[PDB]
Amino acid sequence: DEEKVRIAAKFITHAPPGEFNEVFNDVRLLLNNDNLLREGAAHAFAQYNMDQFTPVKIEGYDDQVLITEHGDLGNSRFLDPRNQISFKFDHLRKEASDPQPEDVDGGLKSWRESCDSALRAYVKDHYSNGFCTVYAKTIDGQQTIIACIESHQFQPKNFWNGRWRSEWKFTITPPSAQVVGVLKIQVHYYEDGNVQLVSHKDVQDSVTVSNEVQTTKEFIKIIESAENEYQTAISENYQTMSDTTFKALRRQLPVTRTKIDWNKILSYKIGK
Amino acid sequence: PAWXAXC
Amino acid sequence: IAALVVDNGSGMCKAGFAGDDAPRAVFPSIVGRPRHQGVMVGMGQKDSYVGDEAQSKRGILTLKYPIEHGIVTNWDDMEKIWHHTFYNELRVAPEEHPVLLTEAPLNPKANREKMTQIMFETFNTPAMYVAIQAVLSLYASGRTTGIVMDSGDGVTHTVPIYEGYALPHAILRLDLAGRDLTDYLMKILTERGYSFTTTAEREIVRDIKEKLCYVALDFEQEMATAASSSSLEKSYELPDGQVITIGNERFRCPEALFQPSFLGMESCGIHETTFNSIMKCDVDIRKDLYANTVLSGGTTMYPGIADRMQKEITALAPSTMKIKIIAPPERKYSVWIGGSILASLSTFQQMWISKQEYDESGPSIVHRKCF
Amino acid sequence: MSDQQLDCALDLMRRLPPQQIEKNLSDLIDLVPSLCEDLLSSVDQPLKIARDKVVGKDYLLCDYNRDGDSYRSPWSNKYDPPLEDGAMPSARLRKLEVEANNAFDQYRDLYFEGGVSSVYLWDLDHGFAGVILIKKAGDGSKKIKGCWDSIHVVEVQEKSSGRTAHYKLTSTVMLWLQTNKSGSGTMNLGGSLTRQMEKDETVSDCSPHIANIGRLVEDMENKIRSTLNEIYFGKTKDIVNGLRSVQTFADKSKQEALKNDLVEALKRKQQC
Ligand SMILES: Nc1ncnc2c1ncn2[C@@H]1O[C@H](COP(=O)(O)OP(=O)(O)O)[C@@H](O)[C@H]1O
Ligand SMILES: [Mg+2]
């Protein structure tokens, strides 16, 4: 038995997020028994859904909250920093339910809930469709803001699927603060043959702390700048420079700029 | 003049 | 007051007042300077010549096109083309009538400023607008959706226009056009011993290209026929009275539009860039496009080109999509025709950038649009 | 049941990344024995390099050059390991095979200026069939990495009279590019396309059958490559721009709105 559940775990863990549910269906059709797959897939889906960072909607909140390690309470429940209410998330099904209220002193927390509320608007202005969450946690005595932004786009009729992930950590320190983050892009097309795009960028920065409005504006300016430069390179450079590097791996026309001629190619072992 | 229609 | 419609084509400038179904001025967009000294001072000879004056005076002038491939190369030369357009070709003061300029999609944003600044500040236009050429073409063809294959002297442009909009993501600018096609004729003529070098001589070749050349429906079958029998051979005599005898060359030149390989061009051929454009669309509109293939601009005139284009693009598309080629006569001028219709709309008569708007906002009027 | 196991196995091998094919295939035959032979035949996978020790030259391994326990080298004409029988070509087909290897060695040299290739032909009662193989790795001195693989499989029908042959070409191109420049992070792109093309041509006294084959291969590789580059730029532009653009799209929507009303007015003024 144990090999089968490790083979399934690799497929479930690495699956493309427009297609992961279908891959689970594929693996459950491939093997004869449900239980050995279902029980491993729950543990995989915990880890997996957190790294997708994807939201769920809770039926009384009227908003979308992202899911992550910084949100994970243990005991199968997740935080909502805006609404301040914990909830259980199902890892197979679409919905989440039975919420419970969460209380704290919230000093450090309150300072960025403002900044979060600001960020939401700039998300609306970055993505046609887009969702966010800003986590508040003490890490080994450090004071941190963890801000995250998300997009899923899919359509079966188009045979393309396209996805976005972002992580930003800002460490509160007077007068000078530190920043760390990662940005990722994944796209798949499969109409007749297949093509895939995979990417990351990692960012480190230093900042200074002044006022609630100014930090709100500044963090957003960095996110704005970084995402727009990252998109600008990934469109404008790749439409030209990738043609030249792909050409350097295989050419479109030869060094001659002519179609080759079989008579001369057979006969003429042209000089060294 | 060499050329058929030119030099 | 009536509007003036101007088509800033690479080869010929088509111009006239709105509502008219044919332009009032059509001339080669050439600034021609002296090749030699003007010894007979009594002539009143000119620092440069333009249009049909340069083409009459061909043998003594260095003919420069101000647009090459598709971009303006020297603004003052283009400015002379415009000055001549107003004062000489149309015999009007540009201060006195609204003006429409055609423009190509994906032309860099600074060009829009230069054109706008020249038209208000050199030519004092009382109102102005700048339009994507290809849109005007379909518009003129009546239809409210389709794919344009517009090719003049400089750029081949493919645009899928849907619900009356250009879809910018699908626009395939192709650097193969009439001028490039002219060059290749020079070479295949050279094979048979005819030579042409001077820029004057280039324009002679252009006259030949517009007459003897045609598109064969299938290349080696035609060529095998031509290699067998002199029946496919015709002639056309230069200004110096000598006939040129020509066969195999007639289909061979415009074959290049289907085979950019013949010229070493890395870009795909005319049917190809059309398909390659179609496929980029919102999938639901694919069949909306295939029934609505629209050809235009001077290079689209060759006999048999539509029938070939059909048999060609039929291979690329999945079958039974009903691909149809819209290629009647008058497609020499669809682009300018479209502007003439657009400039007849009362809503458009509200929509122009006014002289007063530019006189308050300067070139910054375009920065809201250009991103 | 078992036909659906093979179908969902192939769907899985469409959805999983092409970089991990051999890992994922070994895992998939470990999760399903019995299907191993079907899987190894149906699933396409990167080629394997071989060295002919008698000649001192490289070749590539495929299921057509293989005959049971061993593979025939295109240079020495022997199998490794050696065999008591072996399904050899005819002597004249072998001579043709040498001529093909030489022609396609030039072809590859001109298009790639590196990597390795192989050519093999198998005798048929109605003509000949053939495989052309190519492999090329990227520059290991650079940040940018990659590979390109060619598979062309061709079947030739030699007709009874009028010296025509009909050619049926199948082709697959496998790609991965890894890219690590301009300070905008890194991107990996995977690609796999498959095509078929058919033609009939008259045999000539000046150009042998290989020149025909070759004309199809060149026209096919041009078509495949052009298709590939445009598929990359198409999806990498439209989806990435669509995900993280908003303001340009709002201003273009203002142009759409104005232009709509102009088009509505065109209905009336075109009638007028
Ligand atoms: N009947 C014809 N036969 C061949 N070529 C033609 C014909 N009519 C026009 N052309 C070519 O079209 C080119 C210009 O096309 P056009 O679109 O009218 O100019 P522009 O693109 O500069 O506006 C010229 O170079 C000319 O050679
Ligand atoms: Mg034009």
Residue numbers in the entry:
A (entry chain F): 10 to 281
B (entry chain S): 1 to 7
C (entry chain I): 5 to 375
D (entry chain E): 1 to 272
Can you provide the manuscript's text about this entry?
Heterodimeric capping protein (CP/CapZ) is an essential factor for the assembly of branched actin networks, which push against cellular membranes to drive a large variety of cellular processes. Comprised of two closely related α and β subunits, it forms a constitutive heterodimer that tightly binds to the barbed end of actin filaments to terminate their growth. Aside from terminating filament growth, CP potentiates the nucleation of actin filaments by the Arp2/3 complex in branched actin networks through an unclear mechanism. One potential hint comes from the observation that each CP subunit possesses a C-terminal helical extension that protrudes from the body of the heterodimer known as tentacle.
Using these samples and an iterative classification strategy, we determined a Cryo-EM structure of CP-bound cytoplasmic actin barbed ends to an overall resolution of 3.8 Å. Local resolution ranges from 3.5–7.5 Å, with most actin monomers resolved better than 4 Å and CP to 6–7 Å. We observed clear density for phalloidin in all the expected binding sites, with the exception of the cleft between the ultimate and penultimate actin subunits. Consistent with the early addition of phalloidin during the polymerization reaction, most subunits show clear density for inorganic phosphate (Pi). Interestingly, the two terminal barbed end subunits lack this density, suggesting that they are in an ADP-bound state. The primary interaction between CP and the filament occurs at the barbed end face of the penultimate and the inner filament side of the terminal actin subunit. The core of CP together with the α tentacle block all of the exposed barbed end surface of the penultimate actin protomer, with the α tentacle deeply wedged in a hydrophobic cleft at the barbed end of this subunit. In contrast, CP makes few contacts with the barbed end face of the ultimate protomer. However, a clear density occupies the hydrophobic cleft at the barbed end of this subunit, which can be unequivocally assigned to the β tentacle. The CP β tentacle interacts with the central binding cleft of the terminal actin protomer at the barbed end in a manner that sterically prevents binding of other WH2 domain-containing proteins such as NPFs.
